[model samples]
Target chain A: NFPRTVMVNLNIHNRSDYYNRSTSPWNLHRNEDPERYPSVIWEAKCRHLGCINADGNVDYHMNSVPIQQEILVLRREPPHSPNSFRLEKILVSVGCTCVTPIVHHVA
Target chain B: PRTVMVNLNIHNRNTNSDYYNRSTSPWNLHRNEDPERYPSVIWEAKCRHLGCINADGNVDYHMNSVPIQQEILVLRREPPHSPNSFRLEKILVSVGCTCVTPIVHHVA
Candidate 1:
């Protein structure tokens, strides 16, 4: 069997809204858990290699390169609603050629 | 001197073994052998990719193409405290591609 290649990367980021949410109408309830929350999650995006290209050539996106993945960090709220929304963390993952070490960081 | 021959027979046997699939090897699966699990893993990656989305509340998986199972990522603030802060659940990873809506199953 031919060698298989699938790259996966997971990244965690801190919340930037820490300051904004503390003040104004967005003040979260005290019961919400922000201390244990992951700040962000990221995925690699592909500009070329394995990017799911729309252009011609079936192999166009078959180079096996990684792409930048997008993540959404929905804030945690006690009651939970759009009114108490904030970006707590964002996580992104991308297919990799080899096993890339998982990296953790603060946003 | 060490001599090595590509054991096509062992190679064939090893490729199909589940032990190899979970071995130290990373992302080692034939393109067609487990097409079902490929997207399912991708879906798992997506589910955890969003982190909080896979935590609480509700999750909705969307599939456009490919005969693969869909994954849902949901987020919530409350789930009772524990040693691990959050929870990750695998609802369903369906196979076969036709034209249908994604099925949702609540994790118990």
Candidate 2:
């Protein structure tokens, strides 16, 4: 008999000179299918002209002056306990505006 | 001239002797006018199990139900005219159908 469902929200602020990405521990497990990877969802918002892309290979990538999206994930969580787990691949959804196209800047 | 990032996490525990299934979508790529399909897809998980009490007086596993967890992020570009280059608006996380005492509802 359980009365309470625990929900944790980690508010992230891009307070660094460079972009920083973090992974969520929430995920699903399908033990029967070893090859079948766990399904974890990731959403991101870009406050500035930035681009965000899914960590895995599902043909999902976004670049915009400002963009909000559900990034596709290509990997699963590490095999750990329910309370302690790490994301294999952290989805990187940062502002795409910070970078300009390279006009062969390198000599 | 700043940036902000927001993330969410939701957990579902089947403690009511019922199944809980939900979808998560945080996108606006596609148009909503098309009723047949959604521009963005919803990701979801299902929980089906009865919660069990552990010696520590905690519910670790449902009798046969598996627990589920999901997370999503909403991205938005910083408008040039906005006062602040980076702003964090709203963040919400929710779960469903939690009962104080398990199996008692069905028996009652």
Candidate 3:
């Protein structure tokens, strides 16, 4: 098989209660002025292994890796003082390649 | 197929106690005063074609079987967070080529 990356609609904070505000939590603050946040489109992910356009009855394996990315999340700083961005790393699958597995092992 | 010896030219980034015997000359580039360097020899196999040829110029062959995957242990640089000076890492090396025909579905 070959290329299997796909795009998905995504949000910075997936859960509603995780961010700051109510229904519109991540980017909005009910008691404070709204801070500017960039728009996020297209979350890249690969299709799960085992189903693709191929020929034969023999079994084959997949050796795919998910790419890791570092992202910044805005935080309230628990104050009217200053706002800061928090750092975190997230995995994003971008591509896939065909290969065999590690066959030999130590006894 | 041919196997060639390649020099990795391992360089020690840190300044250690070891020193070169004399000053730089036409024979060498690394100085005794400078950081130490080493000639790390490694084997690499080169691939070549080995299918049949005919007088009519019409070629019909399945595939090749001269190369295969090989594994080797190599010395690698350690991360800054680690207390060790270096680390030993396992890496892949291509020893020869493999000719796989009658290609089939890749199912999990």
Candidate 4:
């Protein structure tokens, strides 16, 4: 896997970052688990080398990439009520993949 | 380079898997590796990367992204081959990932 899934907290205020690293959104709803809420981020390893081109092509260029999708998730507003929730679509990364730069553009 | 042309792949097995096609889709509406009977399909191109190919790359900047969604029909079944089982569920898939600056928006 090129990307790692890490949980992030949504209970933050007055910050430029999306989700705070401290605390867990998983245990927020107390006892009754409702449809399973996700508060994780799929972060890529930026330090590793990208995909390699074919044998004949020499390492000319490459591209950094990832897959991001908007998924509908329920927001838990009550600790005991699993049904007390609303659906919202949040954009996030699912996986990471690389592509070989177009050879036609170089010339 | 092509403007906003992203190559995306499904990572069910590993990172090196090919882009999701009929068999890879898992909900192609056709059982087994049968010949494709449906030919009807569709495209719009946008979001050109405003940068120089020879320009210096981003180092300290953690790459931010936005989703480009595509709606595709998927097979969903509560029980394996239940009564009146021919049904499909529409799902959104990520076709491209455009890099952008980290921006936060209020959920409330």
| TM-score of structure candidate 3 | 0.23
DockQ of every candidate: 0.02, 0.02, 0.01, 0.03
* Candidate 4, B53-107: lDDT as tens digits: 1224322133333333444333232234332121234445445433333445999
How far does residue B61 in candidate 4 sit from its true spot (Å)? 34
Between candidates 2 and 4, the one scoring higher on TM-score is: 4
Instruction: Point out where model 2 deviates above 4 Å.
Output: A1-107, B1-39, B48-64, B76-108
Q: After TM-score superposition, what is the CA distance of residue B105 in candidate 3 from its true location, in Å?
A: 5.6
**Docking model 4 quality class:** incorrect
Docking class of 1: incorrect
Model 3 pairs in collision: A55-B105, B64-B99, B66-B97, B67-B96, B67-B97, B68-B96, B68-B97
Candidate 3 structure quality by residue, lDDT tens digits, A3-92: 122111111111112121111111221232233112231232323332121242222342222222222222222222232222112222
Candidate 1: segments with Cα more than 4 A from true spot: A1-36, A39-62, A74-85, A88-91, A97-107, B1-73, B76-108
- Report the lDDT tens digits of candidate 4 across residue range A4-102: 221222222121121211000001112233433433333333222333222322232444334334444445434433333333445544433333443
User: What are the lDDT scores of the predictions, listed in order?
Assistant: 0.24, 0.24, 0.24, 0.29
Model 3, residue B60: distance off in Å is 5.2
Error of 2 at A56 (Å): 36
Candidate 4: stretches off by over 4 Å: A1-49, A56-60, A97-107, B1-108
CAPRI verdict (incorrect, acceptable, medium, high) for model 2: incorrect
